Amino acid sequence: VLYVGSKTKEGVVHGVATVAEKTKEQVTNVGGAVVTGVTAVAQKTVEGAGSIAAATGFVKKDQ
Amino acid sequence: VLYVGSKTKEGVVHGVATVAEKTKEQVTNVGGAVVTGVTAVAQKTVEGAGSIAAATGFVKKDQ
Amino acid sequence: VLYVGSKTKEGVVHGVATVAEKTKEQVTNVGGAVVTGVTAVAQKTVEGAGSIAAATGFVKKDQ
Amino acid sequence: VLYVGSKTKEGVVHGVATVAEKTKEQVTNVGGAVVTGVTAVAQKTVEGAGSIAAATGFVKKDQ
Amino acid sequence: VLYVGSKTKEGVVHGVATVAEKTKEQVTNVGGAVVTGVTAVAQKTVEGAGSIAAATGFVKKDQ
Amino acid sequence: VLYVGSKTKEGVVHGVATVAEKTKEQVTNVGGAVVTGVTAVAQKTVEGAGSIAAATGFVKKDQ
């Protein structure tokens, strides 16, 4: 009995109740990025870069 | 009995109830990116970069 | 009995009830980034950079 | 154009999302009544007695 | 254009999200009544007695 | 244009989000009544007695 990675809960989302009541919803993108409406999301990275919002970068590595 | 990777829950989403009531929903993209409406999503990466929102980058590595 | 990684809860979101009542919702992006409406999100990184809001950077590494 | 019984909604249940997560559920009745777990129920009576919970009455009209 | 019973909503339940997470649930009745777990219920009576909880009465009209 | 029973909302329940997290729930009735857990319930009576909690009365109209 050593339990190194024992009973864990990592990056967990549970017991969520949402009610969305919108009459109109608009998104007009012309460049870059847009991220909307992220709900009940979970991740678990090991040796890596974990993102849940965007990188949104015009990476212009020129010449 | 050592339980190295014992009873885990990693990157888990459970028990979710959502009600969406929208009359109109519009997205007008003209460039870049748009990500909407991500619900009840789970991931687990090992030795890698995990993303749940977009990279959204005009990677212009020129010359 | 040593319990090194014993019964943990890391990066956990539970028991959430939200009610959103909006008549109109608009986003008009013309460049850069926009991130809206992130609810009940959890992450757990190991040896990495974890983000839940965007990088939003016009990385212009020129010449 | 008079619209006496015009566009009505009476006794209506709509847009319901439920998630029930129980490990054990028991009911041990020995007399009378038991009513459990009534969800998303609608009725419309005209000239009558409408019930959605039980009468539960040992009507002992004796002699 | 008179609209006597015009666009009504009477006895209406809409846009409901519930999440129930119970490990054990017991009901042990030995007499009378028990009513549990009534969710998202709607009624509309006209010239009548409308009930959504029980009558629960040992009506002993004797002799 | 007179709008006698115009655009009404009577006995209406909408936009409800609930999250119940109980480990044990018990009800041990031995007589009378018990009513528990009534959520998102709506009624509309006309010329009648509307109840949403029980009558609970041992009506012993004797002799």
From Swiss-Prot, chains A, B, C, D, E, F:
Protein name as annotated: Alpha-synuclein
Lineage, broadest ranks: Eukaryota, Metazoa, Chordata, Craniata, Vertebrata
Source organism per UniProt: Homo sapiens
Chain positions of Sequence repeats: 6-20, 21-31
Residue positions binding Cu cation: 14
Function noted in UniProt: Neuronal protein that plays several roles in synaptic activity such as regulation of synaptic vesicle trafficking and subsequent neurotransmitter release. Participates as a monomer in synaptic vesicle exocytosis by enhancing vesicle priming, fusion and dilation of exocytotic fusion pores. Mechanistically, acts by increasing local Ca(2+) release from microdomains which is essential for the enhancement of ATP-induced exocytosis.
Description of post-translational modifications: Phosphorylated, predominantly on serine residues. Phosphorylation by CK1 appears to occur on residues distinct from the residue phosphorylated by other kinases.
Family of the protein in this entry: Belongs to the synuclein family.
Region 4 X 11 AA tandem repeats of [EGS]-K-T-K-[EQ]-[GQ]-V-X(4): start-end pairs: 1-31
